[PDB]
Every structure is written in structure tokens, then in C-alpha cells.
């Protein structure tokens, strides 16, 4: 591990310094269906006409990115995504830009979102939930080692693959930071107290969100929920959490450590770091190596009927792709 990582940082650093650019054209892909929608761009199932392969293309309208002040966050996402490599992170195949939009072509992950499955099913069993949590633990350990903070962990950002494993997507708030950071971003339900409290934070926000995930997976609903964000923020800083009566004893305490308001007592930010998590009673059966190798028995395999099948994804209205005669935000996005 410390060994594995050391080598991993070396590769990430190479890519960090020399990020790839315009590795494709819009015209090489056949637009097929929208798999998801964004606040300034959507995601489409697309087909590379030369290779016959399908991918998921993320399109971002340059002007909307500017109106929403997400330029640097958009630059972070691409730079970071093209440099990373782990079994549980989506692969950025290509990226290019044109007069109107920015494009990120990634590997298509046929299984759908963890969200849809969780919602439909209700709640996952601790064993099923732990299978997932363990993969997020290894991803964070990998991510933080490269000085990155993910910042948007939620069922909506985790995709299931043919093999029943996890694929983390959406690095829109990912940042390589040595030291503290101050942007208020993420999803309300998963916001750590420090963030909502505007005090400046580090990786520990990623360990809080994990606690919120495991809980949402095992209970079927978030530990803090209301109808309007302010009410949510209220519960989060309150430092009070109630556990469903079916949570195991080991789960109740793993969670009490991750959902530690005091980030100087919070698992993942202590002296032992991630080991305090990997070595917790709840994970006693977990064979970390076996998981990293994908040799464990996945409890659930979503089934897709052939390539390009999009049944595990919701139907969206198809807004048409428009591209201006004129370049739109050339200077802002020159490094993209």
C-alpha cells in the first residue's frame, strides 16, 4: 500500500504536469441518449464511429460555466481526471472543446446509479453496504494520498459496473490542495459542519461524507434531512444523530466516529489516518486486497441487455446540441 501509492503518486505527478488536450472531435461520436443532466451541461451515451465503442460524454456550456463561476472547478476536474488511475474511478477517454462547449468522454458504466437502486430497494444490508463502503475507503485513501479532496460523495455520483463494483464520477469539486480550503460546495445532506460553518477544511470532510453514505445505504435515508437546506444545516452542526434500531453495534460506533463533529476526534483525520477505519470492528471480515483486485463476490449485479443498453438510467428530454459560429470563452478555457 504505502509502496503501491508511492509509485501511484509518481504516475499522477507526470500527468498533472503535462495534461493531455483535444484528443478528439465531436464528429467522431454518434449522439445516442441522455443518461443524466447537469446544472451547465448533460451526459450522453455516444458511439465512437471508428471503433464502434460506446462512451459517456459530458458536455458543458462554456457560458453557463462562466455565469455560474465554475471555471477553476471545471479546470480542476479535467486536469485531475486525466491524471488519475484507480479501479473504482471512471476513465476519461477523450476531451476536447469547441466554440460552444467543453467535452469529457468517459467509459460508459452500464449498471446505473447507486441512487436508483437504493431508492427502489429501500436500504442495503450491512454486508451489502460494507462491500460498497470498503471500495470508497480505498478510493479516498488513494485520492487523499495524491493531495486531492473529492468533495461530492453521494449515491448519485456512484455508478455500478457489469461486475457489480463501484465507479465514482463527477470530479467537479475535486481539488488538489496541500493545506486548508474554503469553498462552500457539495450537497447539503453530505456537508460537514466545518464547511457549513465557513471555517476552512481539509480531507476530513471526505470522511464525514463517507459516514453519511454508509448510513444512507444501511438505513435507506440520510442521518439529517429536512425540506429546506437551512433546516438540514441546522441538524448537521447540532452534533446529534439517531440510529435505526437495526444498525449493528459495530456499525453504530463506526458511524459515531466518522460523524464526529470535532474533526480532531474524527476517524480518518486522527494520528492513524485511514487505518483507524480499515481496522475497525465493522470491517473485520473485509479482505481489502481481494476488494482492490475485484475478486470478491459482488452481492448485486445490475443486468444490462447488451452494449449501449440504457435501461438502468432514467429518460431525459433531449435538448439539441448547438455550437456557435463564434468562439465563446477562449481565454478562460485555454488550458482545457
Amino acid at each position: 500500500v504505502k509502496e503501491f501509492l508511492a509509485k501511484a503518486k509518481e504516475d499522477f505527478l507526470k500527468k498533472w504536469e503535462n495534461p493531455a488536450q483535444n484528443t478528439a472531435h465531436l464528429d467522431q461520436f454518434e449522439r445516442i441518449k441522455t443518461l443524466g443532466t447537469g446544472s451547465f451541461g448533460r451526459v450522453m451515451l455516444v458511439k465512437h464511429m471508428e471503433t464502434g465503442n460506446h462512451y459517456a460524454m459530458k458536455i458543458l456550456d462554456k457560458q453557463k460555466v462562466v455565469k455560474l463561476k465554475q471555471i477553476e472547478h471545471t479546470l480542476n476536474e479535467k486536469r485531475i481526471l486525466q491524471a488519475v488511475n484507480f479501479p473504482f474511478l471512471v476513465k476519461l477517454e477523450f476531451s476536447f472543446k469547441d466554440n460552444s462547449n467543453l467535452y469529457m468522454v468517459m467509459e460508459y458504466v452500464a449498471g446505473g446509479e447507486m441512487f436508483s437502486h437504493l431508492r427502489r430497494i429501500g436500504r442495503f444490508s450491512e454486508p451489502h453496504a460494507r462491500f460498497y463502503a470498503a471500495q470508497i475507503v480505498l478510493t479516498f485513501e488513494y485520492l487523499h494520498s495524491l493531495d486531492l479532496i473529492y468533495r461530492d460523495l453521494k449515491p448519485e455520483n456512484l455508478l455500478i459496473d457489469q461486475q457489480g463494483y463501484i465507479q465514482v464520477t463527477d470530479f467537479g469539486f475535486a481539488k488538489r490542495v496541500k493545506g486548508r480550503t474554503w469553498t462552500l460546495c457539495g450537497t447539503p445532506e453530505y456537508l460537514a459542519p466545518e464547511i457549513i460553518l465557513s471555517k476552512g477544511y481539509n480531507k476530513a470532510v471526505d470522511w464525514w461524507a463517507l459516514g453519511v453514505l454508509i448510513y444512507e445505504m444501511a438505513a435507506g435515508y440520510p442521518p439529517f434531512f429536512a425540506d429546506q437546506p437551512i433546516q438540514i444545516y441546522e441538524k448537521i452542526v447540532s452534533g446529534k444523530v439517531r440510529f435505526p434500531s437495526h444498525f449493528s453495534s459495530d456499525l453504530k460506533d463506526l458511524l459515531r466516529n466518522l460523524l464526529q463533529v470535532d474533526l480532531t476526534k474524527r476517524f480518518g483525520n486522527l494520528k492513524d489516518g485511514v487505518n483507524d477505519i480499515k481496522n475497525h470492528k465493522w470491517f473485520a471480515t473485509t479482505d481489502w486486497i481481494a476488494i482492490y483486485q475485484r475478486k470478491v463476490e459482488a452481492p448485486f449485479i445490475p443486468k444490462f441487455k447488451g452494449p449501449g443498453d440504457t435501461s438502468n438510467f432514467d429518460d431525459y428530454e433531449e435538448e439539441e446540441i448547438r455550437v456557435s459560429i463564434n468562439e465563446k470563452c477562449g481565454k478562460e478555457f485555454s488550458e482545457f
Binding site: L68, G172, C185, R242
Partner: peptide, 20 residues
């Protein structure tokens, strides 16, 4: 039940992230 409460709530669908 908390579950029932969550289901009748306004945030059961896909949650968007907060920018500004």
C-alpha cells in the same frame, strides 16, 4: 416512522449540489 417521513419529504429525488 423516520422512513415514512423521508418518503413524504421533498428530498427523495436526485439531489443537486450547491454552488453559489
Amino acid at each position: 416512522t423516520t422512513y415514512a417521513d423521508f418518503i413524504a419529504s421533498g428530498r427523495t429525488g436526485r439531489r443537486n449540489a450547491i454552488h453559489d
